[PDB]
Design a protein around this nucleic acid. Structure first.
Ligand SMILES: Nc1nc2c(ncn2[C@@H]2O[C@H](COP(=O)(O)CP(=O)(O)OP(=O)(O)O)[C@@H](O)[C@H]2O)c(=O)[nH]1
Ligand SMILES: [Mg+2]
Ligand SMILES: [Zn+2]
Ligand SMILES: [Zn+2]
Ligand SMILES: [Zn+2]
Lengths: 172, 69, 1456, 171, 57
DNA sequence: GTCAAGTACTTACGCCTGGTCATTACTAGTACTGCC
DNA sequence: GGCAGTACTAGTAAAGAAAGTACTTGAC
RNA sequence: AGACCAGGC
């Protein structure tokens, strides 16, 4: 997760030679989708990308306690001129190539260093399987519980979905 | 906890630059941007390692069960 | 289950009977007698609850069958209750027959000829003679000779009507028991029991019986006879009573009336001819369960005995105390009274223990649960372990998204591929690959974990080396040495391969597409499931930590259903509306905008790279065994292709050859003005499979109707459209990984001109909050904000809740018109980076992710922060917040925030936006739980209704709901392109291949249905100008006469009248008659199949869109209609059609004559005047001026005098006498004229304590009347009295109508809505109202005045516009069945436990709620059920009668 | 007032009150006020919004209205409000560092991230509560890009060679 | 009871509140919202209210 | 016979993963010890 | 040396802020 | 197998 509400599980550990690479030589260690932003409207993560990157170039920490910016002095104007004094652009974009084809991409890629968080919801605390195992004593049905090698429940709201498809041997 | 060998985004060796960084901030009164440039950390992925390292192992090491206190 | 172990016997039915005491002394293994469970040294004591004769207990052999723990089934035992006690399931009915019966002649207290009247009406209701029971009632102080002649002819009519109906093929000798004869039997027994309980004297011998009293359970009392009517029991020439005496009475009553109670306790004819006895209601023997079912729990040393052993010990403890109380009576006043008063207390405690064992809520003394409460609710037995169960062979893990998967497959981990296993029996075609699997072992995919031998034995491969495991690989295909097991072969439990089937499942399973059958593909690396992006909107599955289930089916009947029937490729269209749920979502939609642009040009190496990256012929996506390409768009200077021409040859390779290309003319979400001037990129164009114009968008691929994937689904098939979603899913992923897509901070900026446009509009908002405040406060204009009259009335607005609503709706109406001016001006025209480069706009316009209101709040302004209808709430002080002064008229101070998410919102803007954000997080919580119980009430009633082979949908027990599904029997998932005649004409030669007209004539009747469809089309054009009541139709449509699934041309009448309307207009080598012959073949193949679980689909199509959610509205409206079926509707209305003759001035002076006028609405103030010392009162009620209320309410001066004369005081005189009862624990002269002195004298005469009365006869302004009281009375308030009487007195009122409003004319017609229902009184106003067009809202009142079919029409429209308000389209086939199921009895029944009592399936009613109330009603009726309902075939483990199990399979064997 | 709260002067000085500092404008100093007291007075959120003769107090800072976790989400006035509310739930469910006395603890389940970092982008309240003592995350080069196809709906990917080097590693 | 009322300005945090079942009910203080934990000096206030013009009860 | 408020028994999204603490008084008895 | 007082012991007994129908007792 | 508490979607 970020510090803005942008959670999400990991899909693949994508190898370095298959990742995009900039002109400065770096490669990102997190890819996040731009389609997570418009419905969520987290522009604090966009401006953390300008603030985080422009602080990494100068060796400074910019504060981010809220309402230190007005509508006159936008932080996109503030952290853009810090990136423009270092050689990077005012908008926080970098010209990146592809890792697979190696070609120049169309537009410059919006990058930066934001602060992520690792949540405690790993797969290993989830993730149960059962072929056979222990059963309950009076129903002779599988046991509730992941850590007792038990089964998942097919309740009433899943029973009638098997009715609704007309599949009568999946229900049995 | 302790300084990361071999920074995460490119692979430049970074773990040999923590004690040189605290030297170049305390004795030689440099700011944090000049000291990262004197150590050869140019890319901003390499810069945010030594700049933002907490060095929390110095707080762990004060609990030594193998010594009287 | 083992398919190699059959079963020949099947349960056909069950029936609920009372378990008698003689059986359970023969049934019993061993009677248990002492209340010690297990003695010292851990053994079970012989004679106690844990016993070896009741089953094998804890590593010890049984004493009945001699088996161990794993094989002993457990055995029935009992205890001997020494006295007969009350069974708590039957006590409410035992107390009916203990009452209502004579204690002297031991009949009931009715006359014996009227008890016989119910004895032979209930006999006619056992058989299928619902109509002959009323002809029986048409047969008619009185001598007892003609009563025998009356009982003779009634008994001969039954024996003739039963003989005639059983001879005329109607009723079996087992009787007929449908649903509507369960109604007439429950109505008749409830009438019989109600009339038994209301009798003074016994009408056989005329003397009284003492009335019994039940205060609570466990006891019965009889009361002493009165001191007056003991004389009746001397001219015929309190007490606790024993349960042996209650039984002694009813052992005589049920014998003297055996000929009647045989029919009360039987729904069907008693072929056993058993007696009904009073021992049914008592229980002289408790049955202890088998000791297998009451084993103790164990947590280390913490071993506790079971709750039933705690309850059965206390019965045995009392059952020995009651025998030790018989020691002194066996030896034998003071030696007799103390031993009898302690014996009678043992009678109550053994009853209180036999209640508490059966029912915990009938106990007294947090209580120990009984045997009723192991069954009742969720966490019961019917709902926790019968309708839902824990299953074997099933996994659950977090999902991660995955391209490169073929859209019907799931990606399983290696560690799920090892554990889950499938029984393959070895054959001649398995020992190549199933010998290799058993060599690989339990831990090498693809492997095997076990081998099942022929004997039922089972050899595990886990603790085995490879040399031991290759030897068993040579053991598989061997001939059996046992003759008894010679046709059985070995089963190898192999791992899950890539050819198996998987049933995926994400909770909540709101509809059936949330539980689909996917194919498998194993993956090498990690421990998570992998789901393709076309499935992410059907399960409503995102990837922020969703985990979803994976059920692995275990035989070939189930593999053939999740590949063909519950398949994920068959679930493209949902049956709710007929709209697709499957499609590409976020990155693929943003990539087809760039790929199908005019700028996208590809060279020869690029063009051929994108094709093989998506087609890949060796995996079987092409149809030509060679990838064909197109000539390039440009030939000089160097050849370039186009992204139009990418998808042209992508679609040219996945299509089947010798079938022409697709023809589509559709549009998309991006306008022409975003691409410049003269652009045509809004319309898309496919001509012979070639994209020639138009961007591809969400509207084309994605869950949207009539795109290109929806059109590929129709012309070519579902296997093509599921393959196109794979190939386009890889064409756009490979395009993105070489040509990417970003949104940045660059995309959010306006220009320096657009920021100037933004701030200049928002400077007009500084006066908006004051203009809206000055308007509502009824100042004119231009008044300052610090005006003391403005601040005075704003304080008056705040203290009222309704005045604050019309201030929060006028300011919100004005500031949202300032929001609409910035979004119209500053985007897209004022944005710095523009389309297509503006990726914030590019994915909001394309429907990838985002909205136009999302880019508004980012780039322009965030808007009015609306709370639940209103604005931001205000404190008591008139401050909305501590920052703002009290009652200031600023838009910013009330929630309109001007800051945007780009540049920030202020701290008071931030706090208003947090109030609205918490509102959304509570509505996401509290309003997803109310629609969950809507669908459960719906699915339980509609679980068994389904299409029969008559194309006539009906319930599981056989009762008929509708004669045809929707009136036309066509499937919602097949009728999308049915009336798209311009699409089907352009694709004629390609749709003719998939229906194949020439090969489908022999099994049809083409000749006959077309002729009768012309006899009716010619009749209805000739007739049918008259309205519907005149139409004696003389001809049904061809659906009601001919089978539409067999007769070609047997179509609906809207399909015929729209085809003959289409094909008449336009005249386009296909002629006119080959197009109408292919639509009638397209119609017939789009019929609904018999066996479709329609009512589940109809109830999922209402419960699942209900989660998307001056009259009641929404999910509270669906509870009023569907769930409760309330006749006490919350806000009833009535729509009145205004004639064209009466104008708008004659209509709104008309609604002042219907809407009620209270006396409170005409009074300015009431000034009482009390002088005491005779308590006097001077009630002086001051009205408004006569010119003020005779205009406003049309109340004359003289009519207001008659309300005070005849209506106000008669309610005021009552309220003064009511309180004296309940406390015992300037103007004119007096010589005015002769009529007012006698008007006064009539008021004094007809009322109780008036001494003076005078109305303002000349001006109608006042009414003063003196009102004296006695001096004995204490003080009454007499203003709170008068105010409560003035609000109940009516000047003028049409009954049950309180208001009549003339709204604006919605959709052309002129509408007059009231606020109450009275159809009778609106029939008098023919001169103003169309009486034959009066629709309404009260579904129960249209049933009372207009009938059943009018209420069925009313309920469809009211369940329609609860979904039409939210723009939710649910089709009229799901709304039709819910209508016809709720009115199936000619009444208005709910989907609850009160409306389902008239139903044949006992386990359906027991599974829903109140389990042991439907249980008692089944065992009292001795109710046999045929196991028809889906809830009754899961309790007993039968295949369903819906879908696949709606028929049998027979095998043709060649030899005789 | 006309039909408002019942008037009177109510003085409170007992236990268990709710109290916040606020700056009082005549003779500029600190004032401590309560919720029953605040509903009838006019504080301002910044001294550039003081209006004459109506405002008695101003706040020392606008950020003394937010909690501990709420001040630490950076640039919070740019986010939609549920995504600030989701962060306060998810900021306290991280694999962070619980303490440094783990050798002397005996807790039954504990989550320790190995190498935490201080952020480039942080509030000024971050270094005031001493949250450098407890680093709950790490700076990451984040590219907002549709490149992969594997992170579309809500998911994300990591560089593979990043956590071969210890990126986001914990026990 | 779950609503974000404006009287909580500076006392309860508007944003730091969980989702779902504890939404609106469980909520956190502002970080400067101190809670009084001792009875304060009160006994000299009626002596200096009678001098300001208060008629005694 | 009957209206009539009053009293009573019913439901109140799906399933998923963790953790905790879950009999107490007393009463009679056998044994320990201080004592003469 | 053996008697009786306590202190224990293991032993077996008691543990207040929601919707609807349906039955029914109240007076008359 | 319950109670209460903390979460997940
Ligand atoms: N039946 C339930 N489903 C839930 C519950 N919580 C989450 N969900 C499911 O998980 C999904 C979570 O969606 P959200 O609650 O986060 C609404 P949100 O605005 O965050 O959507 P996005 O912004 O598009 O992520 C949603 O589709 C629900 O179907 C719950 O308590 N009950
Ligand atoms: Mg989710
Ligand atoms: Zn680096
Ligand atoms: Zn046995
Ligand atoms: Zn009698």
């Amino acid at each position: 997760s970020s510090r803005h509400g942008q959670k999400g599980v990991c899909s693949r550990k994508w190898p370095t030679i298959d990742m995009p690479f900039s002109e400065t030589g770096i490669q990102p260690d997190i890819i996040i989708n731009p389609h997570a932003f418009p419905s969520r409207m987290t522009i604090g993560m966009f401006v953390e990308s300008l603030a985080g990157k422009a602080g990494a170039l100068h060796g400074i920490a910019q504060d981010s306690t809220p309402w230190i910016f007005n509508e006159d002095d936008t932080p996109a104007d503030y952290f853009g001129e810090q990136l423009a004094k270092a050689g990077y652009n005012y908008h926080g974009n970098e010209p990146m190539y592809s890792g697979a084809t190696g070609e120049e991409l169309r537009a410059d890629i919006y990058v930066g260093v934001v602060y992520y968080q690792r949540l405690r919801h790993m797969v290993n605390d989830k993730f149960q399987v059962r072929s056979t195992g222990p059963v309950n004593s009076l129903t002779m049905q599988p046991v509730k519980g992941r850590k007792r090698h038990g089964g998942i429940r097919v309740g009433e709201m899943e029973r009638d979905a098997l009715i609704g498809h007309g599949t009568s041997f999946l229900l049995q | 906890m302790i300084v990361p060998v071999r920074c995460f985004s490119c692979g430049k060796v970074v773990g040999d630059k923590w004690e040189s960084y605290l030297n170049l901030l305390q004795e030689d009164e440099l700011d944090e941007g000049t000291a990262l440039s004197r150590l050869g950390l140019k890319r901003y992925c390499c810069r945010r390692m030594i700049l933002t390292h907490v060095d929390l192992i110095e707080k762990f090491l004060r609990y030594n069960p193998l010594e009287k206190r | 289950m083992d398919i190699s172990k059959p079963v020949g016997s099947e349960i056909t039915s069950v029936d609920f009977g009372i378990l008698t005491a003689k059986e359970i002394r023969n049934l019993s293994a061993k009677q248990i007698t002492n209340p010690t469970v297990l003695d010292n040294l851990g053994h079970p004591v012989s004679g106690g609850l844990y016993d070896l004769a009741l089953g094998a207990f804890l590593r010890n052999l049984c004493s009945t069958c001699g088996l161990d723990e794993k094989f002993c089934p457990g055995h029935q035992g009992h205890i001997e209750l020494p006295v007969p006690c009350y069974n708590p399931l039957f006590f409410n009915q035992l107390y009916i027959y203990l009452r209502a019966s004579c204690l002297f002649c031991h009949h009931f207290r009715l006359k014996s000829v009227e008890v016989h009247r119910y004895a032979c009406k209930l006999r006619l209701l056992q058989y299928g003679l619902i109509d002959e029971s009323y002809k029986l009632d048409e047969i008619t102080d009185i001598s007892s000779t003609l009563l025998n002649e009356l009982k003779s002819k009634r008994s001969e009519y039954v024996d003739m009507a039963i003989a005639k109906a059983l001879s005329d093929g109607r009723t079996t000798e087992r009787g007929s028991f449908t649903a509507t004869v369960n109604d007439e039997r429950k109505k008749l027994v409830h009438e019989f029991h109600k009339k038994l309980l209301s009798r003074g004297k016994c009408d056989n011998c005329g003397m009284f019986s003492p009335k019994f009293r039940k205060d609570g359970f466990t006891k019965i009392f009889e009361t002493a006879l009165n001191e007056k009517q003991i004389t009746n029991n001397r001219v015929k020439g309190s007490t606790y009573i024993l349960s042996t005496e209650v039984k002694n009475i009813l052992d005589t009553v049920f014998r003297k009336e055996q000929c009647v109670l045989q029919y009360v306790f039987h729904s069907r004819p008693n072929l056993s001819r058993k007696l009904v006895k009073a021992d049914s209601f008592f229980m002289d023997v408790l049955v202890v369960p088998p000791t297998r079912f009451r084993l103790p729990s164990k947590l280390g040393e913490e071993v506790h005995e079971n709750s039933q052993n705690q309850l059965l010990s206390k019965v045995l403890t009392t059952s020995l105390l009651i025998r030790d109380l018989n020691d002194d009576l066996s030896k034998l006043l003071e030696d007799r009274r103390v031993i009898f008063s302690r014996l009678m207390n043992a009678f109550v405690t053994i009853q209180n223990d036999v209640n508490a064992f059966i029912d915990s809520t009938k106990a007294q003394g947090v209580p120990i649960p009984g045997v009723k409460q192991a069954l009742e609710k969720k966490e019961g037995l019917f709902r926790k372990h019968m309708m839902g169960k824990r299953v074997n062979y099933a996994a659950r893990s977090v999902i991660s998204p995955d391209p490169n998967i073929e859209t019907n497959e799931i990606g399983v981990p290696p560690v799920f591929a090892v554990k889950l296993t499938y029984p393959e029996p070895v054959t001649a075609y398995n020992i190549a690959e199933l010998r290799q699997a058993v060599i690989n072992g339990p831990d090498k995919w693809p492997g095997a974990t076990q081998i099942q031998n022929e004997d039922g034995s089972l050899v595990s491969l886990i603790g085995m080396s490879v040399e031991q495991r290759k030897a068993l690989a040579n053991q598989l295909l061997t001939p059996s040495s046992n003759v008894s097991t010679h046709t059985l072969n070995k089963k190898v439990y192999r791992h899950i391969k890539n050819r198996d089937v998987v049933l995926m499942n994400r909770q909540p399973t709101l509809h059936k597409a949330s539980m689909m059958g996917h194919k498998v593909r194993v993956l090498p690396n990690e421990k998570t499931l992998r789901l393709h992006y076309a499935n992410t909107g059907a399960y409503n599955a995102d990837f922020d930590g969703d985990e979803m289930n994976m059920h692995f089916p275990q035989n070939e009947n189930a593999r053939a259903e999740a590949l063909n029937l519950a398949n994920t490729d068959s679930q493209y269209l949902t049956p709710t509306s007929g709209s697709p749920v499957r499609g590409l979502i976020q990155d693929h939609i943003s990539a087809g905008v760039w790929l199908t642009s005019k700028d996208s040009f590809f060279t020869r190496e690029q063009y051929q790279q994108y094709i093989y990256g998506c087609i890949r012929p060796e995996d079987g996506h092409t149809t030509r065994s060679k990838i064909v390409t197109l000539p390039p768009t440009i030939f000089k200077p160097y050849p370039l292709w186009t992204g139009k021409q990418i998808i042209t040859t992508v679609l040219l390779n996945v299509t089947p050859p010798d079938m022409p290309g697709i023809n589509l003319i559709s549009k998309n979400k991006i306008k022409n003005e975003y691409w410049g001037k003269g652009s045509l990129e809004n319309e898309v164009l496919f001509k012979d499979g070639a994209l020639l114009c138009g961007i591809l968008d969400k509207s084309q691929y994605g869950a949207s109707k009539y795109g290109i994937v929806h059109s590929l689904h129709e012309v070519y098939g579902p296997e093509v459209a599921a393959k196109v979603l794979s190939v386009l899913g890889r064409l756009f992923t490979n395009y993105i990984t070489a040509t990417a897509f970003t949104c940045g901070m660059d995309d959010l900026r306006l220009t320096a001109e657009g920021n100037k446009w933004r701030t200049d509009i928002l400077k007009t908002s500084v006066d908006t909050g004051r203009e809206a405040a000055a308007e509502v406060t009824n100042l004119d204009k231009d008044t300052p904000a610090d005006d003391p009259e403005l601040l005075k009335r704003l304080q008056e607005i705040l203290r009222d809740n309704n005045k604050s609503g019309i201030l929060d709706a006028v300011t919100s109406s004005k500031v949202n018109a300032i929001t609409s001016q910035v979004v119209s001006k500053c985007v897209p025209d004022g944005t710095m980076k523009k389309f297509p480069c503006n990726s914030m706009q590019a994915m909001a316009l394309s429907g990838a992710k985002g909205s136009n209101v999302n880019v508004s709040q980012i780039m322009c302004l965030l808007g009015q922060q609306a709370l639940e209808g209103r604005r931001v709430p205000v404190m008591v002080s008139g401050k909305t917040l501590p920052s703002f002064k009290p009652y200031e008229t600023d838009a910013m101070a009330g929630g309109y925030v001007k800051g945007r998410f780009y540049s920030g919102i202020k701290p008071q803007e931030y706090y208003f936006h947090c109030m609205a954000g918490r509102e959304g997080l509570i509505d996401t919580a509290v309003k997803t739980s109310r629609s969950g119980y809507l669908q459960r009430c719906l699915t339980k009633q509609l679980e068994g209704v389904h299409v029969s082979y008559d194309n006539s949908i009906r319930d599981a027990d056989g009762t008929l709901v509708q004669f045809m599904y929707g009136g036309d029997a066509i499937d919602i998932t097949k009728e999308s392109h049915m009336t798209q005649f311009e699409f089907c004409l352009d694709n004629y030669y390609a749709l003719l291949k998939k229906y194949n007209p020439s090969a489908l004539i022999e099994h049809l009747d083409v000749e006959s249905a077309l002729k009768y469809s012309k006899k009716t089309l010619k009749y209805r054009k000739k007739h049918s100008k008259e309205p519907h009541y005149k139409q004696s139709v003389k001809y049904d449509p061809v659906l009601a006469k001919y089978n539409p699934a067999k007769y070609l041309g047997s179509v609906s009448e809207n399909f015929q009248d729209k085809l003959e309307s289409f094909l008449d207009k336009n005249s386009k080598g296909v002629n006119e008659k080959k197009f109408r012959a292919l639509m009638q073949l397209k119609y017939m193949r789009s019929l609904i199949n018999p066996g479709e679980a329609v009512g589940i689909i109809a109830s999922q199509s209402v419960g699942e869109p209900s989660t998307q959610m001056n009259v009641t509205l929404g999910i509270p409206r669906l509870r009023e209609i569907v769930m409760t079926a309330s006749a006490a509707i919350k806000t009833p209305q009535m729509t009145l059609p205004i004639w064209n003759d009466v104008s708008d001035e004659q209509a709104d002076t008309f609604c002042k004559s219907i809407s009620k006028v209270l006396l409170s609405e005409v009074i300015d103030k009431v000034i009482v005047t009390e002088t005491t010392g005779a308590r006097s009162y001077v009630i002086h009620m001051r009205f408004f001026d006569n010119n003020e209320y005779s205009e406003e309410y049309d109340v004359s001066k003289e009519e207001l005098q008659n309300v005070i004369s005849n209506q106000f005081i008669h309610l005021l005189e009552a309220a003064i006498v009511k309180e004296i009862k309940k406390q015992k624990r300037v103007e004119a002269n007096n010589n005015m004229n002769k009529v007012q002195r006698d008007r006064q004298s009539a008021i004094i005469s007809h009322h109780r304590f008036i001494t003076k009365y005078n109305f303002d006869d000349e001006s109608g302004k006042w009414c003063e009347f003196k009102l004296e009281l006695a001096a004995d009375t204490e003080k009454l308030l007499m203003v709170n009295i008068v105010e409560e009487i003035c609000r109940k007195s009516i000047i003028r009122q049409i009954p049950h109508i309180d208001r009549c409003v003339h709204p604006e004319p919605e959709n052309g017609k002129r509408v007059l809505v009231t606020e109450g229902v009275n159809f009778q009184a609106m029939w008098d106003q023919e001169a103003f109202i169309d009486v034959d067009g009066i629709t309404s809202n009260d579904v129960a009142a249209v049933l009372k005045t207009y009938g059943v079919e009018a209420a069925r029409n009313t309920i469809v429209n009211e369940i329609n516009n609860v979904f039409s308000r939210y723009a939710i389209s649910v089709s009229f086939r799901h709304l039709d069945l819910i209508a016809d199921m709720m009115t199936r009895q000619g009444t208005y029944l709910a989907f609850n436990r009160q409306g389902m009592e008239t139903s044949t399936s006992s386990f359906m009613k027991m599974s829903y709620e109140t389990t042991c109330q439907f249980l008692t009603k089944a065992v009292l009726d001795n109710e046999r059920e045929q196991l028809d309902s889906p809830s009754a075939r899961i309790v007993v483990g039968k295949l369903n009668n819906v879908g696949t199990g709606s028929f049998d399979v027979l095998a043709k064997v060649p030899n005789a | 007032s006309t039909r408002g709260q019942y008037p009177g002067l109510y003085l409170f000085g007992g236990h268990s009150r709710m109290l916040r500092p606020v700056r009082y404008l005549p003779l500029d100093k600190e004032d401590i006020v309560g919720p029953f007291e605040q509903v009838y007075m006019n504080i301002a959120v910044t001294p550039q919004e003081i209006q004459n003769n109506v405002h008695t107090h101003v706040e020392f800072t606008p950020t003394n209205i937010l909690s501990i976790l709420a001040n630490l989400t950076p640039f919070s006035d740019f986010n939609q409000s549920p995504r600030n509310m989701y962060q306060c739930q998810m900021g306290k469910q991280t694999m962070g560092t619980p303490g440094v006395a783990l050798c002397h603890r005996s807790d039954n389940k504990l989550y320790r991230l190995q190498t935490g970092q201080t952020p480039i982008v942080k509030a000024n309240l971050y270094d005031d509560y001493g949250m450098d003592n407890f680093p709950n995350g790490f700076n990451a080069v984040v590219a907002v890009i549709s490149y992969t196809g594997y992170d579309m709906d809500d998911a994300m990917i990591i560089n593979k060679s990043a956590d071969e080097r210890g990126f986001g590693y914990g026990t | 009871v779950r609503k974000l009322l404006p009287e909580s300005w500076g006392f309860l945090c508007p944003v730091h509140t969980p989702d779902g079942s504890p939404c609106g009910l469980l909520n956190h203080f502002a970080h400067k919202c101190r809670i009084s934990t001792q009875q304060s000096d009160v006994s000299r206030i009626p002596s200096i209210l009678y001098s300001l013009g208060v008629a005694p009860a």
